Ligand binder design. Structure first.
Ligand SMILES: COc1ccc2[nH]cc(CN(C)C)c2c1
Length: 284
């Protein structure tokens, strides 16, 4: 029975390797990865892979791995797929830990923009969770040299993490990770999957996919939001993506809003993640 080696980059940066039967559905590999991680609240997570255009794609657990990776390597990353709006309602601390690891990478990568103060706060909770109480003996030295807190480190940022770390004496790891998440969940780009697009007039916009719906960034002034319950149908055609909106109260007709994506693969990818968000957050 012929098996393919799978390599999975975990949220701690380490590499998990296993073999699956070459005709395996994605769920088979996902189940092995979640068991490795001791993760029971699996619904929030998924595996990603890179397509022939080096674009990130979700591995569909209900489809054959070979029909998704196609001619590429069986190389994946383990990621948060659906960011919970209220991480306090997750049943397990370890779920919250993996969500923290993902958000830490969202922050360092610059996908999740964050003020100086919130970068320092988040870093101070991570340090408290992983090292425990601030050692007053270290006083001015760098016991935090290995922690990456931001896309760009400054001495001022390091100083501020240490000042806030001192304030968390007695805080336990699940408590510190919960405070991390209570701050991170409030960030305007928390859990937003961003896609470059153009409106029906050709103006460059971004489409954000999240719990709260489909967001439109036209620039820093004039945003828009389509809450999922309003969205009746999501579709794609060639390089175009469409949402059909419920008729408003007293309105005769539905509305369809069209967007141009960078190519056909990009329209199909946006369609799939929107449909998946719409389902997940309808049920949650
Ligand atoms: C906020 O996420 C959603 C997405 C689609 C939905 N369709 C119906 C609902 C009902 N929900 C408000 C309980 C919904 C929610």
């Amino acid at each position: 029975p012929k098996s393919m080696q799978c390599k999975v980059i975990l949220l701690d940066g380490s590499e998990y390797t296993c073999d699956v039967e070459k005709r395996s559905r994605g769920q088979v590999l996902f189940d092995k990865v979640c068991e490795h991680l001791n993760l029971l609240e699996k619904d929030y997570f998924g595996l990603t892979y890179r397509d022939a255009e080096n674009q990130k794609n979700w591995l569909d657990p209900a489809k054959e791995i070979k029909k998704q990776v196609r001619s590429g390597a069986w190389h994946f990353s383990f990621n948060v797929k659906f960011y919970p709006p209220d991480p306090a309602q997750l049943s397990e601390d370890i779920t919250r830990y993996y969500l923290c690891l993902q958000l830490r990478d969202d922050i360092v990568s610059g996908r999740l923009p964050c003020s100086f103060v919130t970068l320092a706060l988040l870093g101070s909770y991570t340090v408290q969770s992983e090292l425990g109480d601030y050692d007053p003996d270290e006083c001015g030295s760098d016991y935090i040299s290995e922690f990456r807190f931001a896309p760009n480190h400054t001495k001022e940022l390091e100083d501020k993490v240490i000042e806030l770390h001192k304030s968390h004496r007695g805080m336990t790891p699940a408590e510190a990770e919960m405070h991390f998440l209570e701050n991170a969940k409030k960030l305007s780009m928390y859990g937003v999957d961003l896609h470059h697009a153009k409106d029906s007039e050709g103006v460059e916009i971004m489409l954000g996919v999240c719990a709260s719906g489909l967001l439109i960034y036209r620039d820093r002034l004039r945003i828009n939001r389509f809450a999922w319950p309003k969205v009746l149908k999501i579709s794609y055609k060639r390089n175009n993506f469409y949402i059909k909106i419920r008729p408003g109260e007293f309105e005769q007709f539905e509305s369809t809003i069209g967007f141009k994506l960078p190519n056909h693969r990009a329209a199909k990818r946006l369609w799939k993640v929107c449909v998946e968000h719409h389902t997940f957050f309808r049920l949650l």
